[PDB]
């Protein structure tokens, strides 16, 4: 792994979004159980005209 | 793995979106169980006219 | 792992969003249990015209 | 791990957001239990036109 | 681990947000128990046009 | 409607089971909704050698 | 409506089970909602060798 | 409506079980809501060798 | 409505179980709300060899 | 409404169980609210060999 050299803008190894959302659970249930899960909107990156050049 | 050299804009190894959404679960259920899951909208990247050049 | 060299903007290894959201749980339930979970909107990155150049 | 060299802006290994949100729990329940969890909006990064250049 | 060298702005290894929010709990319950948890909005980073250049 | 007259056992207008199980709902949903329903075993009547004569 | 007259056992208008289980709901939802419902076992009547004669 | 006249046992208009279990709700939800409901076992009537004759 | 006349046992208009369990609610929610409800076992009637004759 | 006349046991209009359990609520919520409710076991009637005859 070696980073960027150069560029008109700043080259970066930017991690915007990632990870585990409701993963790797170990559930052992008996009879009448309830387990709901809501994961809201994910916005990862550049929004609203960001990282713009003049 | 070697990064970008150059460019008019900044070359980068940008990770915008990724990961595990409701994966790798181990579920053992008995009889009358309920397990709902909602994953909201995923927006990964550049939006709203971002990373634009003048 | 080696960082960026140079760029018109500041090249960085910026981690904006990540992690575990409701992951790796060990749940052992009996009969009539309830376990809801809400994860609100995730905004990771640059918003509102940020990191702009003049 | 080696940091950035240079850039038009300050290259940094900035960690904006991360961590464990409701992860790694060990729950053993009997009969009629209730365990809700709400995680509010997550804003990680640069907002409101921040880190801008003149 | 080696810090940044230089930049137009101050390169730093700034940790804005992180940690464990409701993680690693060991819960053993019997019959009719209740355990709700609310985690408010998380704002980590630069807001309100901060870290701007003249 | 007139009840029974007589019998070796007691004649009765016994209602053992009945009613509405998940009926007459008015549901108006938008986009990504979830609504599961489990109705457990129904036992209506005489069980375990009941209402027996000597 | 007139009750029973007579019998070897007591004639009765016994209502053992009935009613509305999750009926007549008016639900108006938007986007990502979750509404599970579990109704446990229903036992209505005479069990365990009850109402027996000698 | 007229009650029973007579019988070897006591004729009665016994109501053992009934009513509304999670019925007639008016729910107006927006976006990411959760509403689980568990109704435990219903036992209505005569159990364990009750109302027996010698 | 007229009560029982007579019987070997006491004829009665005994109401053992009834009523509204989580019914007739008016819920107006916005965004990320949680409302669980557990109703325990219902035992209505005669149990354990009750109302027996010698 | 007229009560019982006679019987081997005492005829009565005994109300053992009834009422409203979590009914008729008016809830107006905003954003991230939590409202759990547990209703324990209901035992209404005659238990443990009660109202027996010699």
Curated annotation (Swiss-Prot), chains A, B, C, D, E, F, G, H, I, J:
It is found in: Nucleus; Nucleus, Nucleoplasm; Cytoplasm; Cytoplasmic granule. The modification Omega-N-methylarginine is found at residue 51. Changing residue 39 to S: Slightly affects hydrogel-binding. Changing residue 32 to S: Slightly affects hydrogel-binding. Changing residue 2 to S: Impairs hydrogel-binding. Sumoylated in exosomes, promoting miRNAs-binding. According to a report, methylation affects subcellular location and promotes nuclear localization. It comes from the Eukaryota. Changing residue 13 to S: Does not affect hydrogel-binding. The modification Phosphoserine is found at residue 50. Homodimer; dimerization is required for nucleocytoplasmic translocation. Identified in the spliceosome C complex. Identified in a IGF2BP1-dependent mRNP granule complex containing untranslated mRNAs. Interacts with IGF2BP1. Interacts with C9orf72. Interacts with DGCR8. Interacts with TARDBP. Interacts with CKAP5. Interacts with TBK1. Interacts with STING1. Interacts with SRC. Interacts with PPIA/CYPA. Interacts (via C-terminus) with FAM76B; the interaction results in retention of HNRNPA2B1 in the nucleus and inhibition of the NF-kappa-B-mediated inflammatory pathway. It is linked to Inclusion body myopathy with early-onset Paget disease with or without frontotemporal dementia 2: An autosomal dominant disease characterized by disabling muscle weakness clinically resembling to limb girdle muscular dystrophy, osteolytic bone lesions consistent with Paget disease, and premature frontotemporal dementia. Clinical features show incomplete penetrance. The disordered region, when incubated at high concentration, is able to polymerize into labile, amyloid-like fibers and form cross-beta polymerization structures, probably driving the formation of hydrogels. In contrast to irreversible, pathogenic amyloids, the fibers polymerized from low complexity (LC) regions disassemble upon dilution. A number of evidence suggests that formation of cross-beta structures by LC regions mediate the formation of RNA granules, liquid-like droplets, and hydrogels. Heterogeneous nuclear ribonucleoprotein (hnRNP) that associates with nascent pre-mRNAs, packaging them into hnRNP particles. The hnRNP particle arrangement on nascent hnRNA is non-random and sequence-dependent and serves to condense and stabilize the transcripts and minimize tangling and knotting. Packaging plays a role in various processes such as transcription, pre-mRNA processing, RNA nuclear export, subcellular location, mRNA translation and stability of mature mRNAs. Forms hnRNP particles with at least 20 other different hnRNP and heterogeneous nuclear RNA in the nucleus. This is Heterogeneous nuclear ribonucleoproteins A2/B1.
